[model samples]
Target: GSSGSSGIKQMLLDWCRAKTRGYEHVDIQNFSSSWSDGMAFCALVHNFFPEAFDYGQLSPQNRRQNFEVAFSSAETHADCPQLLDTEDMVRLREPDWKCVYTYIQEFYRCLVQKGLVKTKKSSGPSSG
Candidate 1:
């Protein structure tokens, strides 16, 4: 575990920030708090699949609804799984980073699999 998962964590954060940029009421400071309300998750999915749901229809206060819509839309449109449990998520004051991070990784993979995101080859120097 030379790099562990930090490298990917940052990569995912950068992409998530960029993808969700300009989406109202979204400020992705980290994987946990940023996704607590579930708007960030929906924003990312909406950026790719605008037809699945109306971004304008979502509100930050309606947290449970946000989670439900985001998870369902991602699963339906992008073939991504509802890895994050909506019920558990709504009860938490803040989502666990481990849970959010793992879900993000899975979501990213599904995007790549669907050809929605281009997989960038890592340029790190290999052992010689």
Candidate 2:
């Protein structure tokens, strides 16, 4: 059901391509259904930005891997019985996909400046 959304899929694809083509690093924060959707999206994104993004559950192992921030849903409360209820549909409606795009773009920019990601020129200026 998560991947059934074209808007989210397109946003993931575009962000992955941009990162792979040397734009910047992209991070997908998952919470509830977003986590499952995020993992599936990561598989797709990985095809493009194979070495640009990091994946896995946020644990002590991943903490040492240099991921600057972690993405999680607000509805991911331990006492919450219904995880899917926190889909953030209200936020998702604001400008649709702009939030995801901007968040990824800004994070990528920050990674570049921090020297965590090196800019590699794509084959063409318009590649991404």
Candidate 3:
């Protein structure tokens, strides 16, 4: 917290932007359209999840619909997998609900080890 909380947040945002540029789901060409309130979150999903269906087998329309629903609900992967068709919950396409949550938790734990977000340990399911 030395530099300030906002600075940490901006740092996270910058890192997320850099991360998302590698995902095909991101439209770096149409840059403005690429910025969503959940841009960072969507980037985190693709960056941190075990595997996401973004540009894999998912239809473009379904991907868009999924993102729309995900952004609106804005829930974390640890939530109940009822929305398994969307966003990070897409892991449910291949695994159980608990598996998705544990993967997500461990992913953020790795991020912490790599010196991304500064929290010491994840605050369980409510966190990243």
Candidate 4:
């Protein structure tokens, strides 16, 4: 599969931000070198460029590089109010639209099914 890391990362960060009430001190750790790590990276990018979540637009090498930097930054800071433009959001929210969750779940399923992750088993069970 194409490297949907950026989109996946965006979804994760969105979830984190939503859950934490937009805490500013969030930090993501990457240890397994697994696809989930890549997803986390994707989520961060998605936060920045939600429209770029399309796998067809992301090359494999781009995915690898994106995954690398997505989690490296302490916060992966970017311009705020990343909500897509009105027209884009209209298209994005459609039932058939490819949104952040699509990529997130893609990587999540891969990581969970492959059992390539070690940290997941020991991660803080609850978001709290």
TM-score of each: 0.87, 0.32, 0.35, 0.23
Clashes of 4: 9
Overall lDDT per candidate, in order of appearance: 0.84, 0.37, 0.42, 0.38
Give me candidate 2's TM-score against the actual structure: 0.32
Instruction: Pick out the ten consecutive residues of candidate 2 with the lowest summed lDDT.
Output: 74-83
Model 1 per-residue lDDT tens digits across residues 78-97: 77777788898888988888
Candidate 1, backbone clash total: 0
Candidate 2 residue spans exceeding 4 A from truth? 1-36, 40-69, 72-95, 120-128
Give the per-residue lDDT of model 3 (tens digit) for 1-128. 27543443344445555656666555432222333322333555555542432424334445345454433332344332333234443332322433333433444555565565576544555523
Preferred candidate (TM-score higher): 1 or 4: 1
**Highest lDDT against the true fold, candidate:** 1
Candidate 1: worst 10 consecutive residues by lDDT? 1-10
**Quality of model 4 by C-alpha lDDT:** 0.38
What is candidate 4's lDDT per residue for 1-128, written digit by digit as tens?
Answer: 88654454455644534433432223343212223323434444454445545323443344344444443321233312222132332233221223434544544444344453233465555744
Looking at candidate 4, the ten consecutive residues that score lowest on lDDT are: 77-86
Q: Write the per-residue lDDT of candidate 2 for residues 7-51, one digit (tens) a residue.
A: 544654455555444322333333222332334334333433344
Q: Which candidate, 1 or 4, has the higher lDDT?
A: 1
Off by over 4 Å in 3: 1-9, 25-32, 35-43, 52-55, 59-64, 68-77, 80-128
- lDDT winner between 3 and 4, please give it: 3
- Residue pairs of candidate 3 with colliding backbone atoms: none
